[PDB]
Each structure stands twice: as C-alpha cells, then as structure tokens.
Amino acid sequence: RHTVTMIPGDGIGPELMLHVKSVFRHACVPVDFEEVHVSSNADEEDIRNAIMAIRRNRVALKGNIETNHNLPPSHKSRNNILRTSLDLYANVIHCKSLPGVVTRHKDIDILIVRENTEGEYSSLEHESVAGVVESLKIITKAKSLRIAEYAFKLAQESGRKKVTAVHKANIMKLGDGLFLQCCREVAARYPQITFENMIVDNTTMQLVSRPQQFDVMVMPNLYGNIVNNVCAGLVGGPGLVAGANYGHVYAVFETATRNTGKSIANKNIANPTATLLASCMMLDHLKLHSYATSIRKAVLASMDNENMHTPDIGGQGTTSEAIQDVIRHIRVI
Amino acid sequence: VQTVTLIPGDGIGPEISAAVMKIFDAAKAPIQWEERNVTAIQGPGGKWMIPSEAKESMDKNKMGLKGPLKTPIAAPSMNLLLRKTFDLYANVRPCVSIEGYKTPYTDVNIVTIRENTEGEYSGIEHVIVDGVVQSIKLITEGASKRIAEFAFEYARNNHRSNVTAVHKANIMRMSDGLFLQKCREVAESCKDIKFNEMYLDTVCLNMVQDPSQFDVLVMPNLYGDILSDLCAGLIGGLGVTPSGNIGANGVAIFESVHGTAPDIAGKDMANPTALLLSAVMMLRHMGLFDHAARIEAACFATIKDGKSLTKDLGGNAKCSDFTEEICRRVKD
Ligand SMILES: NC(=O)C1=CN([C@@H]2O[C@H](COP(=O)(O)OP(=O)(O)OC[C@H]3O[C@@H](n4cnc5c(N)ncnc54)[C@H](O)[C@@H]3O)[C@@H](O)[C@H]2O)C=CC1
Ligand SMILES: NC(=O)C1=CN([C@@H]2O[C@H](COP(=O)(O)OP(=O)(O)OC[C@H]3O[C@@H](n4cnc5c(N)ncnc54)[C@H](O)[C@@H]3O)[C@@H](O)[C@H]2O)C=CC1
Ligand SMILES: [Mg+2]
C-alpha cells in the first residue's frame, strides 16, 4: 500500500477528491490519501507544509488553488511555488478526442510537454521608477535540455513519431533560439522521432484549423499557457483533460487547467473525467498499471454514453451519477 | 478627394496594392494615392530612419495603406521604424466570419485591441553567463492608460457593447496589475460600455469553444499578437484578416497582418482580401462609410458565390480575376 499526499484545493476540488476516494475504494486500490490543506492566507506556512508532505510521500493528487490577482506582488502563486520547490520541470498534458464528446474537430491526439520551473516562473518584477514596471525572465541550457530530453523519451516510449518544438525564436533570438538548439541536440540522439519546429503564433492558427498534424509538442514556460488551453478547448474543455507534473524524484497530478470552478462548486455538476484521469496517470507513475487501466477504461466507456455527460459538455447528468457509472464499469471487470 | 500615402511594399505587396487601387477606382471612392516606396537609410550619424519624403507625406496625409515589408538580412526592420516614427500605439484587428468561406467557426465578431509600443517591443535579451539568457520587458502607466482609453473610445465609435481586458495577473502581478488598474479607471468614465476581466488562458479556452461571447478584447504587448492570430485562425487565416495601427498626431496606417509571401510572390496568385478590408477599415476611420459598405459588400458577395476564389481559399482563380469580379459588382 502506497501513501499519497492529497491537496483538496478550492472550488470543485474537495468534492472531486471525495469521488476519487470513492472510485479507489471500489476498485480496491492500494493507496491511502494523506490530506494537507492550502488556504487563502497571505502567510506561506500552509504551502511550505504541503511541500514537506510531498518530499516524504513523493507523489500527490491535487485540486486547484484559488489565485487572487488583487493581492500584493509579495504573494506569489501557491501552485507555482509548489512546482519550483519540488523541481517538477515536466508539465505533461494529453489532449485526445473522445468519440462520444462531439466538438468542432475530430482525431486530435496531442501530448504537450511544457517546461515547468523556468521562464515565466522565474519572473522578477520591479517598479524602480514610478509608473514603469520591468520584468526579467530566464531561459537556460540546462533546463531546456532536460525538458527536450523528457519530451523525446516520452515520445519514444509511448510509440509516438513526431516532436514539434513550439517557440518564438524569430523574435526572442537568444532565449528561444537557445531552447530550439537544445531540442536539436536531443533530436540527434533520437533518430526514430521526426523533429520539427513551429512559431507559437503559427501553432495557435494551425490548432484551430488542422490540429490533427500535431503529435508531441515541447515548449518553454512562455506565452501564457495559450497552447495547453487551446488544445484543452478543442477536445471539449477543462472537464476532460488531465495534467501531470514530473521531477526527477517527485510527481504531482491534477486537471490540465487551473480553473477552480468556484461558481459551480457544491452543486453536483462538475465533470469528474479530468480528475479521474489524473488519478490514473498517478497510478501509472506508482507502477499500479492494472488499477490505472481498470479506472481509465471505466471513465472512457462512461464518456461514450451521453446520458452520463455533465453540463460542461452539453449533458444533463450529475457528478455522482457519472461516478456511479464509472464504479459500475469497474465492478464488471 | 483625399490623399492617402500608399506603401506598396515587397513580394505580393505591389500586386495586392494595385488590386486595391483598382477596386477604389471602380467604386468611385474619393481617394488619391501618394506612392511612397520606403527603404531604410542612415541620417544623423549611423541612426536608422525612414526617408524624409515618406515621413513628410504621412505627417501631412495622416492616412496610410501598407503592403507587407521584408525583415532585413543583417542586424532594424521597416515595420519597427514606422512604428517608432509615428508612435503607432494601438493595433486594431477585427475578426468577422465570412459568409461564403466556411470554417468550423461561423459566429465570430471580435475586435482585438493591442498595446503596440511596449512588452515584446521594449525588450532586450542578453547572455548572463554561458547558457543563461535573460529577457527584459517593460510596461508603463502612461501606455496602459492610453490603450485603455483608446479601447473604450473604439467601442463607442463602432457600436460595441463589451470590452474584456485580457491578463495574466497571476504570474505578472505588478505589470498586468498596473494594466488592469488603468483599464478599471477608464471603465468608471465609460459606464455605457460593459467591462470585465479574464485570464488569457481562460480567454483561449473559451474562444475555441464559443467565440460568440467575445466582443472587444484589450491587452498589453507582453505576449505579442498571439491572441489576434488565434482569432484570425477562426475565420480563415492571414489571407482575409485586416489590421490598423493608430498613432500620434491623427496618423493611422492600415495593413495586412500577413507577410510578403516570397514563395508565391510570382505574378498573379495572392489574395488581396486582407489588404482590401484594411482599406475598408481606413475608409471607416475617414468617415467614408458609404464607400466602405459598398466595397465591403462587393468583396463578400464575390467570396459567397465562390466561382473565382484565389488558391489559398480553395479556388483555382488568380488575383487579377478575383480583383476584376469585385470591380464588376461594386459598379452596382
Ligand atoms: N491560471 C490560473 O491560475 C487560473 C486560475 N483561475 C482561478 O479560478 C477562479 C475562477 O474560476 P473559473 O473556473 O475560471 O470560473 P467559474 O468560477 O465561473 O467556474 C465555472 C467554470 O469552471 C470551469 N470548469 C473547470 N473544471 C470543470 C469541471 N470539472 N466541470 C465543469 N466545469 C469546469 C468551466 O470552464 C466553467 O466555465 C479564479 O478566481 C482563479 O482563482 C481561473 C483561470 C486561470
Ligand atoms: N505587418 C507586416 O509587415 C508583417 C511582415 N511580415 C514579414 O513577412 C516575411 C515573411 O514572414 P512569414 O510570416 O513567413 O510570411 P507569411 O505571414 O506570409 O506566411 C503565411 C503563409 O500563408 C501564405 N499567405 C500569406 N499571405 C497570403 C495572401 N495574401 N494570399 C495567399 N497566401 C498567403 C504564404 O504562402 C505563407 O506561406 C518576413 O520578412 C516578415 O518580416 C510578417 C508578418 C507581418
Ligand atoms: Mg503573430
């Protein structure tokens, strides 16, 4: 039996965590959840305790922490502190079309590997002259190489064929150029994977017209998480897509996007798919592949039935009813 | 009759400029073209500038229509020079679905308004130590205030009901915080326009699901024009999207957001829709609404019939034929 840190989070996080525990009990999953909370306080003690719990357990499942963008600049983002302190350098998101969820595009299968410790997370802002705010960001060879290293290894091990570096080296000649060159260095050691590059501007335009062309994407921690959110939107939105954060020793699992769903919280309507699929990726990281396959298959089979769909994807079902169908598919196995 | 400065530009530029001149002539538009072929020189010392001839023209005429221009081979672009000379502080990019040209997004009517002097443009990159690169970007109170004022002014003058400020204030607390602060101040004056704030990543998430919710989007330049490009992708791409840059001293330069297209720069192939619709924006900015509506309708009707479309839109026809058919319909 493994012990895993659980951060319930804000909004729909706590209610979705209960449903995960419920699914886990019914599937006889040898995992016990050790809960730590991250409140809205200006004091950093809560997030530091959370980091401490992750160092001990090495693995976490989390809901999403509310960001208040009206608090003083001294109050840094709690999720990003978690990401930098634990050195979770590889953010991995899998946007894949679900047959039963009909959107404007079919046959999307994109793995996005985003650098998750540098770039925007290294940002320093100062107002040393009144009315002038200057920002200073870092891109490095060491962090660019290990993200590229991660994306290619993932590509080869998943039976993928193409890695596309998404960048703005046409404008940021030194920084994004350095990132691009680090991807090229790694590409030389992976002759079975096709390496390509695309300007971020052109990537977003291609995504809304022909997203089928993309396989694996690798990118620095820049351009405001546009690509991840576009791709999440294309396949049906934040209710569906799971995210993972990997370091050399630690791993943290979550929904692809940061939305807490505050306005729909405690109304039994949140889509549980993303969170359930996040817990499956967690199970795979723990080498509990059999349990991951059972739950994942149940989730996807359930999503094939539109009566189980929640309002975010045009359905009329409740969360608890979708959880009921998931548990039913598990018990049949 | 009114004089506007025409910069024909490079590659497909001269072809599409000639096309626009022809449509305007056929529509009996009160426009005369002052051609200015602008190439970078060195004036006082080694400092790069636009020719006096071209500067005198634009300062006088105030209105400019511009084809695409090249990036220099060796390291100071013409677009940068025009931007700094006339202080083009507001980039306006309307995105409207075209009835004839079907994409998976049919309900799009979005105007992006982007700060055009800072962010990406104020940047310096440099090497800290080997394999460590730092970028430095700037946002100011004055420029944020100016773009916010412009966005609400545009919303009034173009019968728009909603202005959404787009930010990443979770990461960029100080700079986007300053942007939102200044947007909020302007919103207090203009209560006739509904104001809201949205995370950039949430805008992108929703845009792709339902672009109909969005009206006017205002943003700083920290991420360049990526959001505008997303919106462009919804309606058919760079071949159809118009753009305007509004500056100091009444100066406004209108242009296509697409490049020179050197691969198809060979005679009679390029889509002139994008430049034409920028010229339509120019007419509206000049108060020539009747000529704007007619030229606009003639272009849309030509696309709707779809029997003489350019190669980029799926047709087999060439530029001059497409141009000729718009000239045909605008006479009525
Ligand atoms: N990058 C970041 O850090 C972001 C943080 N947030 C946080 O979230 C709060 C706002 O909440 P939002 O969720 O943006 O809007 P909201 O509070 O109105 O909640 C409804 C939204 O939740 C989303 N959602 C997420 N997961 C869902 C699920 N499983 N089922 C159904 N709908 C789901 C839907 O897109 C829907 O529009 C903000 O106060 C902020 O703290 C929001 C967006 C980005
Ligand atoms: N505002 C401006 O003056 C801009 C200038 N450029 C310049 O253009 C040059 C090349 O840049 P890229 O982005 O690679 O070029 P681009 O933006 O033209 O690339 C888009 C692609 O779509 C096609 N395309 C573009 N416009 C078209 C039209 N009107 N009709 C039919 N097909 C069209 C082209 O074949 C090209 O492969 C650079 O030197 C750059 O400085 C680029 C963007 C804006
Ligand atoms: Mg662009």
Author numbering:
A (entry chain B): 15 to 347
B (entry chain A): 4 to 78, 81 to 337
Study text:
To understand the inhibitory mechanism of the αγ heterodimer by NADH, we solved the crystal structure of the αγ heterodimer bound with an Mg2+ and an NADH at the active site and an NADH at the allosteric site (αMg+NADHγNADH) at 2.4 Å resolution using the molecular replacement method. The structure belongs to space group P3121 containing one αγ heterodimer per asymmetric unit. The overall structure of the αMg+NADHγNADH heterodimer resembles that of the αMgγ heterodimer, representing the inactive state of the enzyme. In the αMg+NADHγNADH structure, the NAD+-binding site is bound with an NADH: the adenine moiety of the NADH is located at the deep pocket of the active site and the nicotinamide moiety positioned in close to the ICT-binding site. The NADH makes hydrogen-bonding interactions with a number of residues from the large domain of the α subunit, including Lys69A, Thr74A, Asn84A, Glu260A, His263A, Gly264A, Thr265A, Asp268A, and Asn276A. Surprisingly, in the αMg+NADHγNADH structure, there is an NADH bound at the allosteric site, which occupies a large portion of the allosteric site. Compared with the αMgγMg+CIT+ADP structure, the ADP moiety and nicotinamide-ribose moiety of NADH occupy fully the ADP-binding site and the nicotinamide moiety of NADH occupies the Mg2+-binding site and part of the CIT-binding site, making extensive hydrophilic and hydrophobic interactions with the surrounding residues. Particularly, in the αMg+NADHγNADH structure, the hydrogen-bonding interactions between the side chains of Arg97G and Tyr135G and between the side chains of Asn78G and Arg272G at the allosteric site are retained, and thus all the side chains of these residues are oriented outwards from the CIT-binding site. In addition, the N-terminal regions of the α7A and α7G helices at the heterodimer interface assume loop conformation instead of helical conformation, and make no hydrogen-bonding interactions with the β7A and β7G strands of the clasp β-sheet.
